[PDB]
Amino acid sequence: PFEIVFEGAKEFAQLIETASRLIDEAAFKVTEEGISMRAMDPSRVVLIDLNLPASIFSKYEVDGEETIGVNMDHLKKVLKRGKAKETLILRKGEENFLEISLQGTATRTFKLPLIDVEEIEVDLPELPFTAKVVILGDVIKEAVKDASLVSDSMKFIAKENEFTMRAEGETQEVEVKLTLEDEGLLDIEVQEETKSAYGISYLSDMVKGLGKADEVTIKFGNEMPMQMEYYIRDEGRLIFLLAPRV
Amino acid sequence: PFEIVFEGAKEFAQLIETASRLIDEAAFKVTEEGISMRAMDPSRVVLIDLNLPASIFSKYEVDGEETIGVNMDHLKKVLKRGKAKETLILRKGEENFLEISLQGTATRTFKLPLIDVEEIEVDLPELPFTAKVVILGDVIKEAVKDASLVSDSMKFIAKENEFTMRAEGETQEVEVKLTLEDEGLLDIEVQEETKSAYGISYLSDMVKGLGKADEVTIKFGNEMPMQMEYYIRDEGRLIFLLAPRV
Amino acid sequence: PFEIVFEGAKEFAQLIETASRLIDEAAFKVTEEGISMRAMDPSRVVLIDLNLPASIFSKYEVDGEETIGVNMDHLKKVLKRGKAKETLILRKGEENFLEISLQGTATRTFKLPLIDVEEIEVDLPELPFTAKVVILGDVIKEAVKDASLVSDSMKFIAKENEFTMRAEGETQEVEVKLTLEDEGLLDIEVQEETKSAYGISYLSDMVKGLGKADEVTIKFGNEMPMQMEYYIRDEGRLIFLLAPRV
Amino acid sequence: RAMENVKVYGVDKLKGVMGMTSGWKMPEPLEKGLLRAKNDVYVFKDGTIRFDATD
């Protein structure tokens, strides 16, 4: 029996879309600290970790702690119906429904039957990540879209003070180098030579929904999963975990 | 043997589209008073009533009164080829053709073979309409688009000083309330409790082509057809008549 | 073993698209004077003549003269990945690859395996062209799009101080007249009565990619191919040669 | 290797066969497919190009 009030519903709908393009259902671990999400793709190739501290909400009213079970598709269509500045509200009382209130010029109320979600909890804390880089959003977004031309597996190469991406197909070759000197490369933390490869499809699901004013974190090691991260209103950030190939 | 000159061809093409999305052919009762249209869907579920007083036209030259018979599809593609401010002209002499002249940066002339239309005239004057409400365009447009999510039949409920819309499907529930206090509800004229249901498809055909700066009239009674109306350049307004369900 | 530096990669990609929509492969006769292209459709109905004087390039470094053989499709996808102001670079050394360097916010390197092109050279110099007209781009673009409604063969009629286009199908009729008095008709050079017809499809492939600020040249005679032309950065212009019908 | 052999690159598509139904299931050389596509002529089950007409 809670209520929640979040402003800028279009943003929240965007991020919920982001989580949506990989999994179809998911549960929301609502605690008085904040709203939490954590789930994995069907393929067991990517891990979506959503963290929402209550501070971000214009109002945050939780009485206890409970897990919501919702159809990410239905919620995605619903939240997608919100716009730029209309206010979002999330209410839940006794009954087994979630009430979404979009109030901008007017109030609109939706109800979503909650669905049971068999939870498979796999918490994966910090791991041996050789290199760690921060980079503007549109840099990586452009890059992935480029590797979409020539292949389906994008290879990452992290060298001392230099970050380079690349991909090769049958005859076409794609390369994207950039270093700290370059503008888009905000930071590089080189411990040593790192190299990996990742499913360009999964990356495309990842980086869609990124403007130029989007900073992204990338930790990873030689032939091991990437962990991507980026903040949301500077408090609650999302983190993906992508297993490499080969 | 007339000629007509209307400015803002894109607008007129928009409204002709509006009439287009329900019927495929139709006749234009041109009189020296003005251009008139009146027809009904194939399904006999909706009645489109177009009224065009000659005053709206930058030039209006009718010699007598005659009925045009045109393919709404062909005219729709034609008028759709006009743009924002280019001038529209409608000429007809002896031959069985309609000449459409789009003159903006240049003049362009089209000719449309007129088609005979078997006229089935059903004039339906004022009827017992319990409630009558005015509302901004985008309010209803958003609302219908919302009811498109959960069902195919949108239910309307008019209570004293309060207008509420709703729709329910298998699981989900959609509700849109608003009153005179709310911004988008310009007026309400409550005689008593009114309730109806209507085909969400037909409504979608109706309200498409409505900006926020669009006022709409809605008269209707308990389990009986709605009559919607909205003005066009403040003189000639269009009126739909939608039979309810159940 | 050359290198080339051209600014405004999006423009160049646009024109390369223009050439692309008619032929699938082609060779680039690079000379120290400039980059040249010349090829014909499969149908032997249109001739694309590309002329690029070296002056247009911010840097132009050719050592000798050689012919490049490239997949217009692959190059089209590649160049299409450039944007508004990012800088284009074209490099070629010993190996049988072309290196495309898109450097805006960052540098991105692509490599394209060059392909042998069986060259069928048909140079067609000035020919007896009765009429010759200059006209704004969007005029002809609108016109062709209009003739797309009623027919597949657009007829051109050039009379003294007057240029008129038209097309007729089963029923409908389309006409577009304009003269020197009209704004969009920059020039007319009438030697005598000229009339022709052309494949509206081919014209549509031609004029796509034309803003209002685009001047176009048209030379042609009674029942003979049109030659269209338009400049690119005021130095290197493209010229199409379209065989008439009937 | 086909495009290398016959010197043709501008094929919109090259529609193949879902599965050889011949006994040997020996496949046609791709070059001929490229030339068919380049001219836009279709093939029939033996490798010949036919043209039905009411006689």
Short mmCIF file of C-alpha atoms in Angstrom, two decimals, chain B residues 73-246:
data_model
loop_
_atom_site.label_atom_id
_atom_site.label_comp_id
_atom_site.label_asym_id
_atom_site.label_seq_id
_atom_site.Cartn_x
_atom_site.Cartn_y
_atom_site.Cartn_z
CA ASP B 73 -9.84 8.81 -52.62
CA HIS B 74 -8.62 10.55 -55.77
CA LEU B 75 -9.55 13.96 -54.40
CA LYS B 76 -7.78 13.01 -51.20
CA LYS B 77 -4.52 12.22 -52.97
CA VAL B 78 -4.89 15.40 -55.02
CA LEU B 79 -5.67 17.85 -52.22
CA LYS B 80 -3.03 16.11 -50.12
CA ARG B 81 -0.50 17.29 -52.69
CA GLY B 82 -1.17 20.90 -51.72
CA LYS B 83 0.90 22.54 -49.00
CA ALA B 84 0.76 25.03 -46.13
CA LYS B 85 -0.18 28.29 -47.86
CA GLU B 86 -0.57 27.59 -51.58
CA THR B 87 -3.92 28.74 -52.92
CA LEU B 88 -6.71 26.35 -53.86
CA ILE B 89 -9.11 26.93 -56.76
CA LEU B 90 -12.05 24.82 -57.91
CA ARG B 91 -13.38 25.40 -61.41
CA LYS B 92 -16.08 23.69 -63.43
CA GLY B 93 -17.47 24.56 -66.83
CA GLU B 94 -19.49 22.67 -69.41
CA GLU B 95 -17.53 19.41 -69.51
CA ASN B 96 -17.82 16.68 -66.89
CA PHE B 97 -14.56 17.51 -65.15
CA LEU B 98 -13.50 19.33 -62.02
CA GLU B 99 -10.41 21.51 -62.35
CA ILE B 100 -8.31 21.93 -59.21
CA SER B 101 -5.78 24.75 -59.39
CA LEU B 102 -3.01 24.81 -56.80
CA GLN B 103 -1.20 28.11 -57.19
CA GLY B 104 1.51 29.00 -54.71
CA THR B 105 4.99 29.52 -56.07
CA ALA B 106 3.50 28.27 -59.34
CA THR B 107 0.21 27.16 -60.82
CA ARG B 108 -0.66 23.49 -61.15
CA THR B 109 -3.84 22.22 -62.74
CA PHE B 110 -5.53 18.89 -62.14
CA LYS B 111 -8.71 17.49 -63.63
CA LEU B 112 -11.01 14.96 -62.00
CA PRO B 113 -13.76 13.14 -63.89
CA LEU B 114 -16.91 13.58 -61.88
CA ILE B 115 -18.70 10.40 -60.87
CA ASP B 116 -22.39 9.80 -60.37
CA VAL B 117 -23.33 9.20 -56.74
CA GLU B 118 -26.57 7.50 -55.84
CA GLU B 119 -27.77 9.86 -53.12
CA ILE B 120 -29.41 8.37 -50.04
CA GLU B 121 -30.52 11.46 -48.14
CA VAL B 122 -31.21 10.96 -44.44
CA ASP B 123 -31.49 14.28 -42.62
CA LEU B 124 -31.52 13.88 -38.85
CA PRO B 125 -32.25 17.09 -36.98
CA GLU B 126 -31.87 17.77 -33.25
CA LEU B 127 -32.63 14.76 -31.08
CA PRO B 128 -32.99 14.13 -27.33
CA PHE B 129 -29.46 14.77 -26.11
CA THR B 130 -29.21 14.48 -22.34
CA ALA B 131 -25.71 15.86 -21.91
CA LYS B 132 -23.69 18.32 -23.97
CA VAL B 133 -20.00 19.06 -23.42
CA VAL B 134 -17.28 21.16 -25.04
CA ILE B 135 -13.67 20.03 -24.72
CA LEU B 136 -10.25 20.73 -26.18
CA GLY B 137 -9.21 18.58 -29.09
CA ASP B 138 -6.07 16.93 -27.78
CA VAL B 139 -7.94 15.91 -24.63
CA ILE B 140 -10.29 13.63 -26.52
CA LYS B 141 -7.58 12.62 -28.97
CA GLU B 142 -5.29 11.47 -26.16
CA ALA B 143 -8.26 9.80 -24.48
CA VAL B 144 -9.28 7.75 -27.52
CA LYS B 145 -5.68 6.79 -28.12
CA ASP B 146 -5.59 5.58 -24.53
CA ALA B 147 -8.73 3.49 -24.84
CA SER B 148 -7.13 1.94 -27.91
CA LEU B 149 -4.80 0.12 -25.53
CA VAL B 150 -7.29 -1.86 -23.47
CA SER B 151 -10.43 -2.33 -25.58
CA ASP B 152 -12.34 -1.63 -28.77
CA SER B 153 -15.39 0.05 -27.23
CA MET B 154 -15.00 3.31 -25.35
CA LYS B 155 -17.59 4.14 -22.72
CA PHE B 156 -18.64 7.70 -21.92
CA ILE B 157 -20.14 8.83 -18.64
CA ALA B 158 -21.52 12.32 -18.09
CA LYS B 159 -22.44 13.32 -14.54
CA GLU B 160 -23.30 16.63 -12.94
CA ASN B 161 -20.43 19.06 -13.61
CA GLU B 162 -18.14 16.11 -14.38
CA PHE B 163 -17.20 14.33 -17.59
CA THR B 164 -15.51 10.95 -17.38
CA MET B 165 -14.41 8.49 -20.03
CA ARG B 166 -13.48 4.86 -19.52
CA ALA B 167 -12.83 1.51 -21.10
CA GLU B 168 -12.07 -1.95 -19.81
CA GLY B 169 -10.74 -5.06 -21.47
CA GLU B 170 -9.73 -8.46 -20.17
CA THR B 171 -7.44 -7.23 -17.40
CA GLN B 172 -6.43 -3.60 -17.84
CA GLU B 173 -8.57 -0.60 -17.00
CA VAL B 174 -8.54 2.90 -18.44
CA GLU B 175 -10.18 5.94 -16.94
CA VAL B 176 -10.09 9.63 -17.83
CA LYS B 177 -11.99 12.00 -15.58
CA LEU B 178 -12.19 15.77 -15.84
CA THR B 179 -14.60 18.52 -14.82
CA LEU B 180 -15.17 22.23 -15.33
CA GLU B 181 -12.48 22.86 -12.72
CA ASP B 182 -10.00 21.11 -14.97
CA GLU B 183 -8.42 23.11 -17.76
CA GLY B 184 -9.31 21.00 -20.78
CA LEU B 185 -13.03 20.87 -20.00
CA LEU B 186 -14.27 24.18 -21.38
CA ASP B 187 -17.95 23.52 -20.71
CA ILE B 188 -20.38 20.95 -19.37
CA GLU B 189 -24.17 21.05 -19.73
CA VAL B 190 -25.50 18.31 -17.47
CA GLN B 191 -29.21 17.64 -17.69
CA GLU B 192 -28.84 14.30 -15.87
CA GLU B 193 -26.86 11.05 -15.86
CA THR B 194 -25.75 10.01 -19.33
CA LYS B 195 -23.80 6.90 -20.34
CA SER B 196 -22.96 5.30 -23.66
CA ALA B 197 -20.43 3.20 -25.52
CA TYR B 198 -18.96 3.69 -28.96
CA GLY B 199 -16.66 1.94 -31.40
CA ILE B 200 -13.14 3.03 -30.56
CA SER B 201 -12.21 2.49 -34.20
CA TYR B 202 -14.82 4.96 -35.42
CA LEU B 203 -13.77 7.48 -32.79
CA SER B 204 -10.18 7.12 -33.94
CA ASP B 205 -11.31 7.90 -37.47
CA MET B 206 -13.12 10.89 -36.01
CA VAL B 207 -10.63 12.70 -33.82
CA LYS B 208 -7.53 12.29 -35.95
CA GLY B 209 -6.67 15.70 -37.26
CA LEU B 210 -7.08 17.72 -34.07
CA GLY B 211 -4.57 20.07 -32.50
CA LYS B 212 -4.65 21.33 -28.95
CA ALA B 213 -6.32 24.49 -30.26
CA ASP B 214 -9.44 22.60 -31.31
CA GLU B 215 -12.76 22.89 -29.47
CA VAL B 216 -15.21 20.01 -29.82
CA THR B 217 -18.90 19.70 -29.02
CA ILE B 218 -20.50 16.44 -27.88
CA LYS B 219 -24.24 15.92 -27.44
CA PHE B 220 -25.66 12.55 -26.45
CA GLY B 221 -28.00 10.60 -24.20
CA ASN B 222 -28.26 7.30 -22.39
CA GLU B 223 -27.64 4.55 -24.94
CA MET B 224 -28.04 6.64 -28.08
CA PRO B 225 -25.80 8.10 -30.78
CA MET B 226 -23.28 10.81 -30.07
CA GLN B 227 -23.19 13.95 -32.16
CA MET B 228 -19.75 15.55 -32.36
CA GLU B 229 -19.09 18.95 -33.86
CA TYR B 230 -16.25 21.35 -34.42
CA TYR B 231 -15.92 24.57 -36.37
CA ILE B 232 -13.67 25.28 -39.33
CA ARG B 233 -12.44 28.86 -39.62
CA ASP B 234 -15.26 29.72 -37.21
CA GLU B 235 -17.94 29.61 -39.89
CA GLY B 236 -18.34 26.15 -41.39
CA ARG B 237 -18.21 23.29 -38.93
CA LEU B 238 -18.32 19.53 -39.31
CA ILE B 239 -20.61 17.21 -37.37
CA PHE B 240 -20.38 13.44 -36.95
CA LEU B 241 -23.19 11.20 -35.69
CA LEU B 242 -22.07 7.92 -34.16
CA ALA B 243 -24.48 5.15 -33.19
CA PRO B 244 -23.70 3.54 -29.83
CA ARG B 245 -23.26 -0.17 -29.14
CA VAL B 246 -25.18 -2.83 -27.24
#
